[PDB]
Design a protein around this nucleic acid. Structure first.
Ligand SMILES: [K+]
Ligand SMILES: [K+]
Ligand SMILES: [K+]
Ligand SMILES: [K+]
Ligand SMILES: [K+]
Ligand SMILES: [K+]
Ligand SMILES: [K+]
Ligand SMILES: [K+]
Ligand SMILES: [Mg+2]
Ligand SMILES: [Mg+2]
Ligand SMILES: [Mg+2]
Ligand SMILES: [Mg+2]
Ligand SMILES: [Mg+2]
Ligand SMILES: [Mg+2]
Ligand SMILES: [Mg+2]
Ligand SMILES: [Mg+2]
Ligand SMILES: [Mg+2]
Ligand SMILES: [Mg+2]
Ligand SMILES: [Mg+2]
Ligand SMILES: [Mg+2]
Ligand SMILES: [Mg+2]
Ligand SMILES: [Mg+2]
Ligand SMILES: [Mg+2]
Ligand SMILES: [Mg+2]
Ligand SMILES: [Mg+2]
Ligand SMILES: [Mg+2]
Ligand SMILES: [Mg+2]
Ligand SMILES: [Mg+2]
Ligand SMILES: [Mg+2]
Ligand SMILES: [Mg+2]
Ligand SMILES: [Mg+2]
Ligand SMILES: [Mg+2]
Ligand SMILES: [Mg+2]
Ligand SMILES: [Mg+2]
Ligand SMILES: [Mg+2]
Ligand SMILES: [Mg+2]
Ligand SMILES: [Mg+2]
Ligand SMILES: [Mg+2]
Ligand SMILES: [Mg+2]
Ligand SMILES: [Mg+2]
Ligand SMILES: [Mg+2]
Ligand SMILES: [Mg+2]
Ligand SMILES: [Mg+2]
Ligand SMILES: [Mg+2]
Ligand SMILES: [Mg+2]
Ligand SMILES: [Mg+2]
Ligand SMILES: [Zn+2]
Lengths: 57, 235, 46, 110, 119, 45, 192
RNA sequence: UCUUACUAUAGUCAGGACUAUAAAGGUCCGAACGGGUUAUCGUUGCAAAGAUAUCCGAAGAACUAUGGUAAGCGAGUGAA
RNA sequence: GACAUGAGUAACAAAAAAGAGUUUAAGGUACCUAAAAGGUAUCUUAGAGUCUCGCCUAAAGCUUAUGGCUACGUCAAGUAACGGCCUCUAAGUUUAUAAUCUGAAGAUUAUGACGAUGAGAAAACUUUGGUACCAACAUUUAAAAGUGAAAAUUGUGCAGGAAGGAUAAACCGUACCUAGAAUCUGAAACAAGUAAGCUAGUAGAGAAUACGAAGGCGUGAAUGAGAUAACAAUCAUAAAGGAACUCGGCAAACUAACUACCGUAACUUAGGGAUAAGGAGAGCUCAUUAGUCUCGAACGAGUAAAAAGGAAGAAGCAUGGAAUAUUGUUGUACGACUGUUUAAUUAA
RNA sequence: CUUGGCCGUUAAAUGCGGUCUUGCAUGAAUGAUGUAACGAUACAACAGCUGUCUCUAUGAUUGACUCAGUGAAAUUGGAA
RNA sequence: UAACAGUUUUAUUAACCUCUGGUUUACCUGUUGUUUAUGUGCCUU
């Protein structure tokens, strides 16, 4: 680098259009009703059901 | 290719129940061998006196056992009787200050060395089947399978308790075709008399039960000259 | 540039060159000890 | 057909450089990008450099019609045509050729 | 596809047995059947041409495949030619071997007049 | 043994302890005479 | 500059990428389900359905090709040409199911999924649908159009069919599995 | 304790070939080992001298280990 | 000295490689449950282990050195199955003694002392100089055979191959690490470097080459998961041509090893050149057998014996089938030659 | 001076080899001169061989690229 | 009229895989060395 980068030009590169995008693709689990991700399985029900099918069956 | 057995109940040829898994006892799984139906099997092609006595040495700190036909052990015994149980667990040599005589087996027949070489075989085969194929201690007893490879290899080195139970089994007729039996075939069969010399009286209690043809003596010949006094429970 | 000159170095040669007896028993060595002693050193040799 | 980010050889037909006669890390590179101070002290606009290639319109002119089938719905033209299979194309009379006869233009409208 | 330093087999009774291509006349792309080339005689056979002479030649058959209008492709086992003069006429009087059929369309009727078999 | 000369046909496995491990419980390689019986269980120390 | 990839290479060598799929399909038949990354689940999905297709053939060439995909054929072959062959006798393709899940490893945050065998003992969508009907019957609510659709999907080709589904729902109610579930009529009034 | 030479006590050189020898050769092919020929890579390197391939010697003026000796006015050692 | 910039960028790529289950301790969340608790599931930190797959292997394995900023319950009269200490001395050392020399410091010779990298009784019980010597090389020898050591026997070449002494159990060492996965040296958790023994088997002349039983490993998140642009590195293949490239065949490719095979030019210091050049053969199956070996009873049979074996035969595009050994020839200059040299830009 | 003349080699010879030599400025142990053998020395030619090239193309792995974790350096009078 | 037969080259730019070729690292076939697992496996009364 020939010259030090100013506070202005570095704040541009750091935050101009690189803001964290919000996760808006969320729905509720049909079994427990907890907030889950769209098209994904519920982690709370997956573990419980995965453990419930191990004891009896 | 190896074939491991499962810890399932099975029948024993010995007169006693070697393990809780033993269903039956004194079961004949094969006809009497050549020398089994012989009153006096002799030392045919072996030196004079060979087989009349069988010694057992153990590591007083770790419990590694070694069987020997002679009153002493050499480097051959450690290499041909100690399997690899991990790094820093198989000694490079025999240290005189660690290895002591565990017990000595003497037979009544002063010239029937063949009966001794048979007991020495079943003892070495049982040991090999204790270091390998130990399915009876994987989930029960010491639970070697629930331990680390470092701590597991140390419990496999402690063959002293297992060896004492092998003597009570081998001397009780355990093993297919061992010459500790004596089939008359007039068909009546019986066991041969034997004596076990112990350096520590408490060691003979590793076996849950001993046969009726074994006599227990304290002190091994040649031990007193080394200024090593035996351990007695009654004192 | 520097070289790995302490590879395969033995501690027997450390005592024969820079040991204590190699100095009290020599004319020049007594100066080293007397110099290091006036400075206050704790490690007079090796 | 889309070619993605293309180098200098596939995009501009650059010759490349040597392969073994001492060449160092420059086999498919473009080399110099202009002249020194006396040429502007800058890379001139329009300089041929790597970039995305393809996925652009392309016109193939003067392709005769070999077959015409109404049932199959096909129009067989001679030669090649830009794009992949299953892509839409625009077929029209040639601009560098006289229009079809006046009778044909009327018959089709009729 | 005959190019510079390509070795060919001369199949006429002109005196050359193996010629080396030195120049493709009238084009930049490598020579195919029926193209002119300046060659250099490298071997002879037992006003013939001696070793080292420079003459014009015509590629009669090549080892590279040659597509044709009707989709029929031909391929020979070697590259051969026949020497000619700058005027365009053959030097030899007899051609020994099969020649490519592309000589007819490239104005080489004289070469085909003495061609025993065409392929 | 029929042929005894040192060049006789070799048909034995010279790797005696092939696939035999005590830490992995590989089991015995061959069927021994004490392999059909349960291992005697001793009394712990 | 060249052709597009035919499949995922998964940043592995030729020999390493083949054994990876043979191990994922070997563990799928042994455990009936595996939880791995989504790209690995979708690559093994094409090899798992091509192995069950070999189990529904009669020639020996299919029995030898299946022996070359599994890593313990002697142990897993009787099951492939046995239970599994009988399970998918009437299902024309689509013997596997890939369901997206939360990252298995929170460190890398890599998208994960569950590759399972449909109509199997460890079918996750068959249980998740049973928990939904169990919650609906326990809350006096009406099942949605999507729940009714998933109910038929997980009972059409199953051996017991609806009987096995009603038993799953009954076992989840006697266990109080739906204890603490949020009623669907209160989801619009929740911000967390 | 690097390195050069010397010195004392020790150690190493698969196998094969030719040669007058069973063993007499600064012999030959080629591992270990010892060199570092060419090339590429690397150049804020894995490395303040490395990696890969290729190449040379490999019973000798060979190589290696543990000690010892000779160096800083004169120059120690130096197949230079 | 603190804090910026580059920049949340490079980097965490030794061309071994991972995948799916299980599980312990402590703690953080959600739900069940409101008597605290406990249970189910999940996440974090520090671990352990099972199955499958791959890598190293005359090692990246095991046993021990040099050494050690790894850790302290590591245990011996001696041999088998141990070193030191101790005894003897080599090269050398000496602020020891005597003599001598010397501006002082000191130096010299003799003697003494000291000094291992060497030599030291017995034990599975034990306490003269070829009448030679134990350098190199070769040979022979623990009697069923073969292999490898120990020591000895005999011989060979010149380069001609130590010294000295003899002949009831103290003290010190003993853990762990051996460099591809947490320890040595390289400023460090470095793709480098470092001693000795062992280092499965198949197959080979072999420690070459390929596979790899056990063992270890596939790093302390010092990383992991995706996608598979340009370009770079490291590689594979390629129509026709075959050095047209270039300072120059740089690099790459061709060639290649093996046989008790055939054959081999000019020239020559008569040794060579020469493994010249240039050709032939190879695996599987099998007729056949003088002896050796085996079986039965001289003879017969047998390769589920080692070998020999032929102008025998079968199949395929191909039988030096995969891996390993990097072309041939020719004319000059310089230096006879093998060697040595600027450690780390010049190896001539 | 100079790519010295001539001959051979090349389609083309400032090269190489042979020869003529009036050698700016060869020469006899600062050795002169010709062979065999040897050479990772240097120059030149031939055969074979090849992506060296005509003229590049495709494919594989690791980087490059994106996400998550950790987190440098040279450099910088101030900069719209 | 019908039928039959004949109606440029070179260079350059771009596009395109029908043809001739090249490539093919999860296709088919043959094959060598070695290893692992499974199955099977000699003569005689
Ligand atoms: K500018
Ligand atoms: K050197
Ligand atoms: K001692
Ligand atoms: K003095
Ligand atoms: K080369
Ligand atoms: K043959
Ligand atoms: K040399
Ligand atoms: K095409
Ligand atoms: Mg130790
Ligand atoms: Mg220096
Ligand atoms: Mg050193
Ligand atoms: Mg596309
Ligand atoms: Mg190019
Ligand atoms: Mg390059
Ligand atoms: Mg300007
Ligand atoms: Mg990656
Ligand atoms: Mg492979
Ligand atoms: Mg030194
Ligand atoms: Mg030599
Ligand atoms: Mg660079
Ligand atoms: Mg040589
Ligand atoms: Mg050599
Ligand atoms: Mg940047
Ligand atoms: Mg970037
Ligand atoms: Mg990066
Ligand atoms: Mg918890
Ligand atoms: Mg002394
Ligand atoms: Mg010593
Ligand atoms: Mg390292
Ligand atoms: Mg290493
Ligand atoms: Mg370090
Ligand atoms: Mg090797
Ligand atoms: Mg290790
Ligand atoms: Mg890993
Ligand atoms: Mg080509
Ligand atoms: Mg070709
Ligand atoms: Mg040229
Ligand atoms: Mg040119
Ligand atoms: Mg054929
Ligand atoms: Mg020389
Ligand atoms: Mg240098
Ligand atoms: Mg150099
Ligand atoms: Mg002179
Ligand atoms: Mg990042
Ligand atoms: Mg096509
Ligand atoms: Mg496949
Ligand atoms: Zn849920």
């Amino acid at each position: 680098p020939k010259k030090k980068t100013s506070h202005m030009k570095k704040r541009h590169r750091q935050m101009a259009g690189k803001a964290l995008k919000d996760v808006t693709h969320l729905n509720r689990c049909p079994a427990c009703g907890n907030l889950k991700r769209m098209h994904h399985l519920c982690s709370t029900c997956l573990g419980k059901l995965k453990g419930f099918m191990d004891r009896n069956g | 290719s190896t074939h491991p057995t499962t810890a399932i109940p099975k029948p024993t040829t010995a007169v006693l129940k070697t393990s809780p898994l033993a269903e039956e006892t004194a079961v004949e799984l094969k006809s009497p061998s050549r020398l089994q139906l012989k009153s006096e099997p002799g030392n045919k092609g072996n030196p004079k006196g060979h087989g009349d006595r069988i010694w057992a040495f153990h590591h007083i700190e770790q419990g590694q056992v070694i069987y020997s036909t002679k009153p002493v052990i050499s480097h051959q015994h450690l290499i041909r009787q100690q399997p690899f149980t991990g790094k820093n667990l198989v000694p490079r040599k025999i240290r005189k200050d660690y290895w002591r005589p565990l017990a000595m087996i003497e037979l009544a027949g002063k010239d029937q060395g063949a009966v001794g070489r048979s007991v020495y075989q079943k003892l070495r085969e049982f040991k090999k089947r204790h270091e390998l194929d130990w399915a009876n201690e994987a989930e029960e007893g010491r639970k070697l399978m629930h331990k680390s490879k470092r701590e597991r290899g140390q419990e496999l080195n402690d063959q002293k308790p297992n060896s004492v139970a092998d003597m009570a089994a081998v001397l009780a007729g355990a093993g297919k075709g061992n010459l500790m039996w004596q089939v008359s075939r007039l068909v009546k069969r019986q066991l041969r008399r034997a004596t076990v010399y112990w350096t520590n009286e408490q060691d003979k209690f590793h076996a849950r039960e001993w046969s009726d043809n074994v006599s227990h003596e304290v002190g091994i010949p040649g031990e007193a000259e080394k200024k090593r006094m035996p351990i007695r429970m009654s004192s | 540039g520097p070289r790995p000159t302490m590879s395969g170095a033995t501690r027997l040669v450390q005592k024969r060159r820079h040991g204590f007896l190699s100095r009290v028993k020599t004319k020049n060595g007594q100066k080293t000890l007397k110099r290091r002693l006036a400075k206050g050193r704790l490690r007079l040799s090796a | 057909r889309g070619m993605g980010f293309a180098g200098g050889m596939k995009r501009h037909g650059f010759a490349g450089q040597e392969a073994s006669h001492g060449n160092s890390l420059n086999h498919r590179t473009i080399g110099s990008v202009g002249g020194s101070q006396g040429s502007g002290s800058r890379v001139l606009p329009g300089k041929k450099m790597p970039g995305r290639m393809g996925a652009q319109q392309h016109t193939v002119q003067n392709l005769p019609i070999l077959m015409v089938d109404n049932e199959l719905g096909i129009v067989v033209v001679k030669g090649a045509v830009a794009g992949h299979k299953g892509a839409v194309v625009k077929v029209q009379d040639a601009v560098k050729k006289a229009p079809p006869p006046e009778e044909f233009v009327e018959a089709t409208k009729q | 596809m005959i190019q510079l330093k390509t070795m060919l087999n001369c199949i006429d009774n002109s005196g050359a047995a193996l010629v080396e291509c030195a120049m493709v006349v009238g084009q930049k792309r490598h020579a195919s059947i029926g193209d002119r080339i300046v060659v250099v005689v490298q071997k002879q056979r037992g006003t013939k041409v001696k070793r080292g002479d420079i003459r014009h030649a015509v590629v009669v058959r090549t080892k590279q495949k040659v597509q044709r209008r009707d989709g029929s492709v031909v391929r020979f086992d070697d590259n051969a030619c026949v020497l000619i003069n700058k005027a365009g006429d053959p030097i030899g009087s007899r051609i020994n071997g099969v020649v490519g059929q592309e000589l007819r369309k490239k104005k080489w009727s004289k070469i085909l007049s003495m061609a025993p078999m065409q392929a | 043994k029929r042929h005894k000369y040192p060049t006789a046909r070799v048909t034995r496995d010279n790797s005696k302890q092939r696939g035999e491990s005590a830490l992995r419980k590989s089991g015995t390689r061959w069927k021994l005479s004490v392999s059909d019986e349960p291992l005697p269980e001793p009394v712990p120390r | 500059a060249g052709a597009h990839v035919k499949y995922r290479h998964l940043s592995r060598s030729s020999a390493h990428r083949q054994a990876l799929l043979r191990n994922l399909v070997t563990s799928l038949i042994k455990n009936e389900t595996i939880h791995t990354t989504y790209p690995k689940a979708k690559e093994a999905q094409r090899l798992a359905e091509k192995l069950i297709t070999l189990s529904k053939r009669d020639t020996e060439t299919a029995r030898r090709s299946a022996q070359g995909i599994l890593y313990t054929p002697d142990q897993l072959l009787p099951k492939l040409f046995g239970e599994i062959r009988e399970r998918y006798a009437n299902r024309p393709g689509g013997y596997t199911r890939v369901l997206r899940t939360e990252p298995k490893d929170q460190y890398s945050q890599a998208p994960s999924a569950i590759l399972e065998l449909v109509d199997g003992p460890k079918d996750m969508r068959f249980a998740m649908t049973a928990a939904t009907v169990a919650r609906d019957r326990e809350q006096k609510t009406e099942s949605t159009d999507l729940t009714k659709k998933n109910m038929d999907k997980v009972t059409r080709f199953r051996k017991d069919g609806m009987r096995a589904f009603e038993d799953m729902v009954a076992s989840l109610r006697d266990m109080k599995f739906t204890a603490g579930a949020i009623n669907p009529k209160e989801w619009k009034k929740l911000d967390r």
